[PDB]
Write an enzyme that holds these catalytic residues in place. Structure first.
Site, PDB file in Angstrom:
ATOM      1  CB  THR A   9      -0.943   0.041   1.213  1.00  0.00           C
ATOM      2  OG1 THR A   9      -0.179  -0.029   2.425  1.00  0.00           O
ATOM      3  CG2 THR A   9      -1.943  -1.106   1.166  1.00  0.00           C
ATOM      4  NE  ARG A  11       6.039   8.839  -2.022  1.00  0.00           N
ATOM      5  CZ  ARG A  11       5.564   9.134  -0.819  1.00  0.00           C
ATOM      6  NH1 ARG A  11       5.897   8.418   0.252  1.00  0.00           N
ATOM      7  NH2 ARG A  11       4.748  10.176  -0.682  1.00  0.00           N
ATOM      8  N   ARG A  88      16.530   9.065  15.116  1.00  0.00           N
ATOM      9  CA  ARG A  88      16.835   7.920  14.263  1.00  0.00           C
ATOM     10  C   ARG A  88      16.728   6.610  15.033  1.00  0.00           C
ATOM     11  CG  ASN A  95      10.796   1.506  10.369  1.00  0.00           C
ATOM     12  OD1 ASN A  95       9.618   1.752  10.587  1.00  0.00           O
ATOM     13  ND2 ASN A  95      11.524   2.204   9.518  1.00  0.00           N
ATOM     14  CB  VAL A 118      13.000  -1.682   0.791  1.00  0.00           C
ATOM     15  CG1 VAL A 118      13.007  -0.244   0.310  1.00  0.00           C
ATOM     16  CG2 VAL A 118      13.255  -2.653  -0.366  1.00  0.00           C
ATOM     17  CB  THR A 119      12.125  -1.000   6.291  1.00  0.00           C
ATOM     18  OG1 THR A 119      11.050  -1.765   5.721  1.00  0.00           O
ATOM     19  CG2 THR A 119      11.568   0.002   7.302  1.00  0.00           C
ATOM     20  CG  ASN A 120      16.123   3.747   4.642  1.00  0.00           C
ATOM     21  OD1 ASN A 120      16.894   2.867   4.260  1.00  0.00           O
ATOM     22  ND2 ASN A 120      15.766   4.772   3.875  1.00  0.00           N
ATOM     23  NE  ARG A 151      18.360   8.520  -4.614  1.00  0.00           N
ATOM     24  CZ  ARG A 151      17.814   8.209  -3.449  1.00  0.00           C
ATOM     25  NH1 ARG A 151      18.558   8.000  -2.377  1.00  0.00           N
ATOM     26  NH2 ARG A 151      16.489   8.114  -3.358  1.00  0.00           N
ATOM     27  CG  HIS A 175      20.888   3.776   1.938  1.00  0.00           C
ATOM     28  ND1 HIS A 175      21.316   4.492   0.841  1.00  0.00           N
ATOM     29  CD2 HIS A 175      19.540   3.897   1.962  1.00  0.00           C
ATOM     30  CE1 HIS A 175      20.272   5.022   0.228  1.00  0.00           C
ATOM     31  NE2 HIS A 175      19.182   4.670   0.885  1.00  0.00           N
TER      32      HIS A 175
HETATM   33  N1  LIG Z   1      17.063   3.231  -0.457  1.00  0.00           N
HETATM   34  C1  LIG Z   1      16.202   2.650   0.364  1.00  0.00           C
HETATM   35  O1  LIG Z   1      16.497   1.644   1.016  1.00  0.00           O
HETATM   36  C2  LIG Z   1      14.854   3.239   0.491  1.00  0.00           C
HETATM   37  C3  LIG Z   1      14.204   3.084   1.678  1.00  0.00           C
HETATM   38  N2  LIG Z   1      12.860   3.296   1.801  1.00  0.00           N
HETATM   39  C4  LIG Z   1      12.150   2.844   3.027  1.00  0.00           C
HETATM   40  O2  LIG Z   1      11.072   2.027   2.652  1.00  0.00           O
HETATM   41  C5  LIG Z   1       9.968   2.209   3.574  1.00  0.00           C
HETATM   42  C6  LIG Z   1       8.722   2.521   2.784  1.00  0.00           C
HETATM   43  O3  LIG Z   1       8.704   3.931   2.463  1.00  0.00           O
HETATM   44  P1  LIG Z   1       7.409   4.522   1.736  1.00  0.00           P
HETATM   45  O4  LIG Z   1       6.800   3.466   0.886  1.00  0.00           O
HETATM   46  O5  LIG Z   1       7.746   5.829   1.109  1.00  0.00           O
HETATM   47  O6  LIG Z   1       6.433   4.788   2.973  1.00  0.00           O
HETATM   48  P2  LIG Z   1       4.856   5.047   3.008  1.00  0.00           P
HETATM   49  O7  LIG Z   1       4.513   5.769   4.264  1.00  0.00           O
HETATM   50  O8  LIG Z   1       4.445   5.658   1.713  1.00  0.00           O
HETATM   51  O9  LIG Z   1       4.306   3.549   3.088  1.00  0.00           O
HETATM   52  C7  LIG Z   1       4.598   2.781   4.278  1.00  0.00           C
HETATM   53  C8  LIG Z   1       4.084   1.375   4.102  1.00  0.00           C
HETATM   54  O10 LIG Z   1       4.287   0.647   5.338  1.00  0.00           O
HETATM   55  C9  LIG Z   1       3.047   0.241   5.868  1.00  0.00           C
HETATM   56  N3  LIG Z   1       3.103   0.399   7.314  1.00  0.00           N
HETATM   57  C10 LIG Z   1       3.297   1.570   8.000  1.00  0.00           C
HETATM   58  N4  LIG Z   1       3.311   1.415   9.299  1.00  0.00           N
HETATM   59  C11 LIG Z   1       3.120   0.054   9.484  1.00  0.00           C
HETATM   60  C12 LIG Z   1       3.038  -0.738  10.643  1.00  0.00           C
HETATM   61  N5  LIG Z   1       3.148  -0.257  11.876  1.00  0.00           N
HETATM   62  N6  LIG Z   1       2.844  -2.066  10.479  1.00  0.00           N
HETATM   63  C13 LIG Z   1       2.738  -2.546   9.234  1.00  0.00           C
HETATM   64  N7  LIG Z   1       2.797  -1.898   8.075  1.00  0.00           N
HETATM   65  C14 LIG Z   1       2.992  -0.584   8.267  1.00  0.00           C
HETATM   66  C15 LIG Z   1       1.994   1.105   5.186  1.00  0.00           C
HETATM   67  O11 LIG Z   1       0.736   0.438   5.116  1.00  0.00           O
HETATM   68  P3  LIG Z   1      -0.553   1.251   5.648  1.00  0.00           P
HETATM   69  O12 LIG Z   1      -1.430   1.591   4.469  1.00  0.00           O
HETATM   70  O13 LIG Z   1      -1.198   0.243   6.551  1.00  0.00           O
HETATM   71  O14 LIG Z   1      -0.123   2.494   6.391  1.00  0.00           O
HETATM   72  C16 LIG Z   1       2.589   1.236   3.795  1.00  0.00           C
HETATM   73  O15 LIG Z   1       2.336   0.085   3.003  1.00  0.00           O
HETATM   74  C17 LIG Z   1      10.417   3.289   4.569  1.00  0.00           C
HETATM   75  O16 LIG Z   1      10.894   2.716   5.777  1.00  0.00           O
HETATM   76  C18 LIG Z   1      11.528   3.993   3.803  1.00  0.00           C
HETATM   77  O17 LIG Z   1      12.482   4.609   4.651  1.00  0.00           O
HETATM   78  C19 LIG Z   1      12.174   3.940   0.802  1.00  0.00           C
HETATM   79  C20 LIG Z   1      12.745   4.244  -0.341  1.00  0.00           C
HETATM   80  C21 LIG Z   1      14.172   3.993  -0.587  1.00  0.00           C
HETATM   81 CL   LIG Z   2      16.680   6.846   0.001  1.00  0.00          CL
END
Ligand SMILES: NC(=O)C1=CN([C@@H]2O[C@H](COP(=O)(O)OP(=O)(O)OC[C@H]3O[C@@H](n4cnc5c(N)ncnc54)[C@H](OP(=O)(O)O)[C@@H]3O)[C@@H](O)[C@H]2O)C=CC1
Ligand SMILES: [Cl-]
Ligand SMILES: NC(=O)C1=CN([C@@H]2O[C@H](COP(=O)(O)OP(=O)(O)OC[C@H]3O[C@@H](n4cnc5c(N)ncnc54)[C@H](OP(=O)(O)O)[C@@H]3O)[C@@H](O)[C@H]2O)C=CC1
Ligand SMILES: NC(=O)C1=CN([C@@H]2O[C@H](COP(=O)(O)OP(=O)(O)OC[C@H]3O[C@@H](n4cnc5c(N)ncnc54)[C@H](OP(=O)(O)O)[C@@H]3O)[C@@H](O)[C@H]2O)C=CC1
Ligand SMILES: NC(=O)C1=CN([C@@H]2O[C@H](COP(=O)(O)OP(=O)(O)OC[C@H]3O[C@@H](n4cnc5c(N)ncnc54)[C@H](OP(=O)(O)O)[C@@H]3O)[C@@H](O)[C@H]2O)C=CC1
Ligand SMILES: [Cl-]
Ligand SMILES: [Cl-]
Ligand SMILES: [Cl-]
Ligand SMILES: [Cl-]
Ligand SMILES: [Cl-]
Ligand code: NA
Ligand code: NA
Ligand code: NA
Ligand code: NA
Lengths: 312, 293, 293, 312
Positions: A9, A11, A88, A95, A118-120, A151, A175
């Site tokens: 769900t 981004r 942080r 996370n 992927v999560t940071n 990048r 990262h």
């Molecule tokens: N280079 C890299 O490694 C990159 C790292 N990232 C990381 O990827 C992650 C995703 O970012 P992004 O997609 O922009 O974030 P968004 O806020 O757009 O989406 C977050 C997602 O996580 C879910 N979620 C949020 N909180 C919880 C929870 N407590 N339990 C379960 N699911 C949850 C959301 O579902 P819901 O609809 O239920 O809220 C949604 O699917 C981030 O941690 C970001 O830092 C992102 C891009 C690049």
């Molecule tokens: Cl990033």
């Protein structure tokens, strides 16, 4: 082949899922999210299926919200993460709780599963995912400095006004602000970048500064990276499911393959195949490059210790 | 070739721009949005460039807000649209006019692909305000409905279907040209007519569906592929002597835009349904044009 | 875009045309040969079209023999060449002149890719007789030698190499820019220098090697990919003040042809070897130009 | 994956080998020819390897001239054939001797091998190959009317001035003067061709006549088809090694799947996968189409009987 995207769900998760479903090697993409968000995945499923109809690509798009809906997947992409009065360390703890909630004990049910975190913080959470899941050290990786390298590749390509695929660069380490650009392994059209007319007019430090700040700058402007990591995720999954056995910068567990460093998940060049990390290639890093790496491993180890102490 | 995406900050605009830039025939994508959205475009540009590097693709990504930033484009994709139905058509029509009024004067060889809904009406508005030839202004309408209809029949890649008419409740499923070898159909139709709204109430709006469809249409144009694709195009008597209306019809699309409206042989019941659809679209078109005056 | 292949009845011409037509950026391939070879071209056209259908690709394939059949092409690929070495250069030079003398007058924006050997000399001839800008006439020379050299090192995709100088016995392997991470080398070199003759005595002549290389060069041009590729290009003092010679050098190739000769940093021994190569090419070029007078 | 091309020194075999080596699913292309011609394959091997270096594609190019050099191949493409005072029966006998010489007893050493026959008469020789090899009926196919369909697809596309991939036609029966164009299954952009404005102005009979004579016309002008069959061979091999399970007109053994016809290798639509002919799809041929087919099966059966009697 089944690829489950935890957090579809979101981004990155939604865009990664859409692109992953176009890969010929991916036969099923399972969209996973929290129960209350499943209704939101139904709309995404229909939308992706429509995109597949336009691309004339076949793929089954399923939806789920429990362990039994993705544990049997060949690749599990962890894109779930809390959004950014939060330090942080607090983000890492929250996370990390999501990592354990989804990936803990996955090896008992699927010992042959590959996890792409992927999560940071990806470096810290990549280590967390490996331990809670109990999977082998080579079946868990993170995006790491893969996106950072892309990048940096943009800046090099635009400076020389060459096609992006003509540039091959490599950034290792965290990262984050401790990343290490490997200029020794950077080239433009097979030519060492150092021997390129124009390198003297290229402000490396400035370029490296933009890459380090690109993540935050995008969040403050567009709201967060999306297509960049979506495509990078697609490439990694394709390399694995097709067993391409190609070296790609990813966050992987080190076990003495480089400068005897051990017990740390950090960005390093690894040959990826159907069995995960087939090997961690030793690089001929220069003196300054090796030093900068050591400082990066120290930061990641410290952050990883704090994260594991909190998951206890 | 240069492709401008007006509305690149939107769900469809942003995704379309990212997938358009991947095309080897698209050498430049210009992201256009309102002045207050420049920051979003700076971030989107950075993120799209990163995706191209990961894909081993390339495209110069530029940003802008004024006319001179996109009037020189080879293809202008219109995805800008506000979030009653008549008011929405009027507001959206005013956006088409503000962006495309008089494009032919500065770039007579420009092609416009309207995505904003009501696409059938707004395709007609964009043609009139721009002054471009009738073959250079198309809309993405019943094509996306055909994709959703293909999914259902694909369940019951090598399922080929075709839906004509309005991109709405008066669409005409052309069963006579639906082959997997030629072929509850009434139920499946009702599902496609509500597919858009059901995606809006769940995901918030279609995104990758239209993004990929836009990509295919632009690629078909820029590479002069001459494919028979359903698009919202101006009719000048090619089908049943129907003229002065932009509606979803089978057209052969190439570098010059609509090369010819393919007069598909429709059954009696299918032809009557297309006549009913044209009436609704013509009426709605008149109301939108009157408000733009 | 239209690509003309002069010499399409030949081993390299026919294969190059077939693979060029597959490219989505090549909308038309014109097969050009001598009047007595029209029949061969009619058959080749039919067979190439069949291959496109099998590949789900498309391209209008035309045939001709006169100037007006190919002078309007965006890229003209010169593969026509008769079956001593000086006599061969003279005869081949006369073919370049008969086909390309004065192309700039009728199509100043044309690009020529010479394949006929000696490519370094004939690249210079084609530039002078055609009158086109120095950036619009290139030759396929040391690039193919780099591919054969890559194979050997690949044995001992991610092996990238570069060879400059003449497409002959005076080629300069640039070890300074050979990375798999930067790197019997003397033996491997001797194998590449004899690779052409060894293929001629066995298979009869290279075919798919140069065909694929031609395809890559044309695609790089027509899609403005701006890739740093080794091609035989006119020098005007970009490397060691060397001017008035067409020889294999690293150049950034795009839609406008040679966008810039990339002054690669060469070692002392590599630079001395490039100077020796330029001398041989210049001498041979003078003899060919004198015979064309 | 290993694809052996018997007769790689030839026009079709060389071009097929070069294109086959570019497929990602093909990891090795073995060039097979008579002993005295092995020296000619050495030049072709180097030339193909150079083309792979230009395409940045990985593939091992081997050369051989004995059974042990190709019997272990996943797919064996038979492109060896005598060149054209020789009747069609004499050619069939000579080419049939080559089939037996190469493919006889292959099943004993490799029961899981797939054979793609290209030598003409492909329909008759496809049957010969199946019997001498002893392989299962689904592991032996011939190019058949696949190329004829592509040639007919060119004429349809050019008539409507549409992209070639927009046309889907189907020709069944013999790869000869008894071929049967299936207009019921012919379409342009998903639309039945009969409902297309312009079909009335399309001289089918003329187009069908050109396709029937195209093979000979090309031999008399260019010297023989080359890229057409090379690409068609590549597509068939890709469909098999990638298990695409897609229906493609090929010459296959009939076993009562269509009008109860049996004991004949003729051009029919078959779903091809890693295991060969997964099934022969029944088609809804019209009255005239079914009749024309029957006449075609009669000719192929007669020619096949004469060919088998001579191999005895
Ligand atoms: N280079 C890299 O490694 C990159 C790292 N990232 C990381 O990827 C992650 C995703 O970012 P992004 O997609 O922009 O974030 P968004 O806020 O757009 O989406 C977050 C997602 O996580 C879910 N979620 C949020 N909180 C919880 C929870 N407590 N339990 C379960 N699911 C949850 C959301 O579902 P819901 O609809 O239920 O809220 C949604 O699917 C981030 O941690 C970001 O830092 C992102 C891009 C690049
Ligand atoms: Cl990033
Ligand atoms: N034809 C089809 O099949 C499809 C039709 N559509 C149509 O396309 C349009 C875009 O949809 P979607 O992207 O989901 O919508 P979003 O609301 O997500 O995006 C709308 C876009 O239009 C811009 N915009 C909004 N209001 C105005 C205005 N008054 N003047 C100028 N620009 C404006 C926004 O920029 P800002 O950041 O400034 O708000 C943004 O770029 C809609 O009209 C929708 O109905 C969409 C999907 C498929
Ligand atoms: N640069 C490189 O790396 C490579 C260089 N080459 C060069 O390319 C050329 C083509 O080689 P290849 O195709 O193998 O040779 P072929 O002999 O097989 O083909 C020669 C071609 O040139 C035509 N031709 C021959 N003589 C004349 C003439 N007097 N006037 C006009 N046209 C003529 C032939 O047409 P017709 O049917 O009428 O005889 C045919 O189309 C050669 O000069 C060769 O050295 C080739 C491979 C790679
Ligand atoms: N639609 C279709 O099914 C098509 C059918 N074909 C068929 O494919 C075959 C190949 O045609 P083409 O490549 O143009 O022919 P060529 O004459 O160009 O090549 C014939 C090949 O067969 C080999 N060969 C010839 N005689 C013998 C023999 N007695 N024993 C072993 N090997 C032999 C030759 O090797 P060597 O160097 O030793 O002579 C060479 O590799 C023909 O039978 C042709 O009819 C071709 C195209 C399309
Ligand atoms: Cl996307
Ligand atoms: Cl919609
Ligand atoms: Cl080829
Ligand atoms: Cl050569
Ligand atoms: Cl044939
Ligand atoms: Na898929
Ligand atoms: Na692009
Ligand atoms: Na083409
Ligand atoms: Na390969």
């Amino acid at each position: 082949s089944k690829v489950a995207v935890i957090g579809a769900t979101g981004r990155v998760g939604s865009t990664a899922a859409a692109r992953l479903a176009l890969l010929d090697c991916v036969n099923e993409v399972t969209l996973i999210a929290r129960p209350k968000s499943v209704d939101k995945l139904r709309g995404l499923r229909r939308d992706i299926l429509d995109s597949l109809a336009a691309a004339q690509k076949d793929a089954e798009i399923t939806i789920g919200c429990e362990r039994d809906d993705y544990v049997d997947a060949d690749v599990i992409v962890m894109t779930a993460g809390i959004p950014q009065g939060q330090t942080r360390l607090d983000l890492t703890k929250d996370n990390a709780a999501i990592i354990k909630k989804y990936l803990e004990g996955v090896a008992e049910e699927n010992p042959e599963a590959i996890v792409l975190v992927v999560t940071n913080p990806v470096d810290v959470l990549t280590y967390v995912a490996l331990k809670v899941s109990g999977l082998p050290k080579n079946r868990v990786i993170g995006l790491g400095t893969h996106l950072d390298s892309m990048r940096f590749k943009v800046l090099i390509a635009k400076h020389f006004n060459v096609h992006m695929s003509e540039v091959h660069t490599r950034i290792i380490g965290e990262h984050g602000d401790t990343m290490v650009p490997v200029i020794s392994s950077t080239s433009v059209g097979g030519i060492p970048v150092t021997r390129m007319p124009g390198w003297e007019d290229f402000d490396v430090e400035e370029a490296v500064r933009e890459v380090k700040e690109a993540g935050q700058r995008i969040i403050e402007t567009w709201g967060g990276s999306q297509f960049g990591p979506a495509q990078a995720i697609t490439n990694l999954v394709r390399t694995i499911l097709q067993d391409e056995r190609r070296v790609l910068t990813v966050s992987a567990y080190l076990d003495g393959e480089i400068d005897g460093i051990r017990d740390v998940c950090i960005g390093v060049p690894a040959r990826l195949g159907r069995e995960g990390v087939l090997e961690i290639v030793p690089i001929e890093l220069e003196e300054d490059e090796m030093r900068a790496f050591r400082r990066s491993v120290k930061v990641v180890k410290e952050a990883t210790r704090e994260a594991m102490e909190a998951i206890s």
